[model samples]
Target: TIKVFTTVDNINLHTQVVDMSMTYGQQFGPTYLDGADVTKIKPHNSHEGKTFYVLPNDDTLRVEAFEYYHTTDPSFLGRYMSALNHTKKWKYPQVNGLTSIKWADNNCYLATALLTLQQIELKFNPPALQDAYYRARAGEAANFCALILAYCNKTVGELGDVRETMSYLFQHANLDSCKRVLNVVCKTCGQQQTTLKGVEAVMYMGTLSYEQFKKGVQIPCTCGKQATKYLVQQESPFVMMSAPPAQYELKHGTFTCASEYTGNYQCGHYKHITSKETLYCIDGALLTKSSEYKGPITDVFYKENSYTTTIK
Candidate 1:
């Protein structure tokens, strides 16, 4: 209702529904921190597929997102009718018990963002009420307050132009604003990033020149805990030998054992065993175990290899 733009129209409002479950995702991020995967925060019925509005304010653009309500309040009928008239209608409510995917900007999220405990608990201290919208939205309210507070504490110093910054980053950097917002919320609550890992190594200098190989990284931990894992060791065998693709998964002592012998030879087991052998504790235990320094060979089953020849 406020005149931020005189020519305000649908275009100025930049109203459009983005299919988050399609473009970005139905889940929160590539990395699912905690068990947020089950909760599926973005599909909250407030954000998904709702009309997100972007308005021009001076040089910047403000996006109206995470705003919703269930029932229309009596205020729409004016103060005189407030007491006498029940002129309220239902709003475009939560879609898809399964994947309308419309909840990316859910009402729960809206109420979470708007009617915080600050607004809710004001009367008893002595705190308060009169918020029909708050009562209407009390259904979806949950630990989302922590999500809001985390955003408040870490996101920006204060507020005013969060919408501006969000849209600005989206338009300028071509970054997904949803990811940025959801990612932080994930951290205060969710995953590390999800992606492939590439490890580049330089070997004996000649055809040993090589680029890093792409390793499709972790999905989750074994015991089902999302324990953070480290990429401690990597191997980029020289391409000349044309080794067959070996193991498909990384294990705890991954680099340390279980080498596939190209041909039956004690040396194959020897080098694979001792060279990768490492034993020690981490920093709290104050130690770093490392592989034994050794030469890499290009031997056949029982001979026919040398450093200069392998190098050659």
Candidate 2:
């Protein structure tokens, strides 16, 4: 006979006796079982049997009540009950050439590589650590590349330029310089109207206009002998002339005046008017009248030097 003791809510204990042969063969027991019986035989609950027996007075009751309340009430367990709450619910922002894996996975790879450096810092002491130092230092290169790639993915966003910058940075292995160049290169380019003058006007304004000061003037003489040139700025005169005349006789012995003129010649005699006229270049051209002008000109006397003419 086996005597088994059990407890009710109070200190009241009950004992049961079973014949060993009968129980062993038939496995017969009380139709009703106490909590202790279930708890002793199969204690699947976290708070049960010897695990809870060591607690002080009412401590076990408190722990059990705490766990029970937490499991039953939605707010008692807080966010833990909904474990998926902390998970990334929204999709990560798209990155070019990164469709093979998630953006978060790339970040995780970078973080793990960065973590290696931390591990090296924590474990290895000073210069005495050679292998880990090189290993972790090498890891830093990969980590920096990954970080730049991710940065380009977010900020630069273009695959071709991002690849070019990445290649540049990798080749130079200078992050600061690369970043500076990228800042200048990727800066927003825009155009705004600006009134510029002089050389600056030529640079930004595409073209420019200005009032040209007349420096000199040319005056022609009516005589075949000479012409006068005047400098407006200096208030001076210069002389330009045709060759001197020659004397010749006709069959009647009458004196005839003749001149070999390189530019212009004129003689009024014997009613035989021998004369040559000077040709002058005409400034500008019909282009000024047509749409051939390349740009706008504010001056009324603007001339197209691209074309000229000789006039008699």
Candidate 3:
């Protein structure tokens, strides 16, 4: 399960678990953390696994969370870096060579900015980890919004100029815009809505909101695996792929191939063919070219066809 803690600029500090599979972007939920419990830990020079403690003497908070990689999958890391670069670069309008801006892009911009902030925190702000979770949640929301905007752009036309494009994004990202996204998810995913929550777990610091549903967000999956393997408090931006299929076998089948499915097969009959299995790519080389259809984002703007990755 993914854990989350928050401290809102001295206003409040608490810890909460985001409901399962409730991701604002990669993974985020439940804005609930207790300030009193945070006072128990004393800052000591001890190497630990992702420690979050407070220094009573100086009244300062500290956080230390890093990726605990159990596998040596270089491809995962490479894909993560590629996605990170794509998300970072695309968030900037200038990079896309667009002169006109829209409001939806603002969502992407805010998401990218938030992601950058988290990266800075993970890299530098060890002493002030109070807002780490908040940054994560906001970043996740921003990334999710950015993705929505990207999808919207794909459906919409290409506009020139930065400011105008950003305006369109902003217009679509109001409270109503968020509602629209929820509605779409509800209609399409239904019970699968929990998967969206999983995405939030990685992007946001588990601050799931269900204002639209007063009973609270209903998380549906108990897959054990989180959206990302690394904590946002430790890494910059990461991408998470769904659990690998339990079985992979190539057999004879009949099916039609579309433009997108060249070299793909059509399964008409279940024919078992024993063929020599071959390992094609090395660990890191695999992710360098792989593309994740959906993943997490935080405080990062987005562009059409922009990619993202994670080191989970």
Q: Who wins the lDDT comparison? A: 3
lDDT over C-alpha atoms for residue 222 of model 3: 43
Model 3 spans with C-alpha error above 4 angstroms: 1-72, 91-212, 215-312
Kindly report the root-mean-square deviation of model 1 from the true structure over all alpha carbons. Answer: 25.1
Poorest stretch of ten by lDDT in candidate 2:
177-186
Cα lDDT, model 3, residue 147: 32
lDDT tens digits, residue span 265-287, model 2: 22111111111121111111101
Query: Model 1, 1-312: lDDT tens per residue?
Result: 111111111233433333334422332122111212222333334443333212223332322111221112222112211211111211222221100011222222222123122211111110011233234344332222222322222221122221222222122211111111001112123443332221111111121111211112223444454433222222222111112323222223323221122233322221121112352211111223454322232211111111110110
Clashing pairs in 2: none
Least accurate 10 contiguous residues by lDDT in model 3:
254-263
lDDT of 3 by residue, 21-130 (tens): 34322222111112123222332223122222222111232221122211233232223222323343332222111111123322322322232223221231211222
Top TM-score prediction, candidate number: 3
Question: Would you list the rank order by TM-score, best first?
Answer: 3, 1, 2
Off by over 4 Å in 2: 1-142, 150-163, 167-312
The C-alpha stretches of model 1 lying farther than 4 A from their native spots are: 1-13, 16-60, 63-137, 142-147, 154-312
Error of 2 at 36 (Å): 48
lDDT at position 309, candidate 2: 17
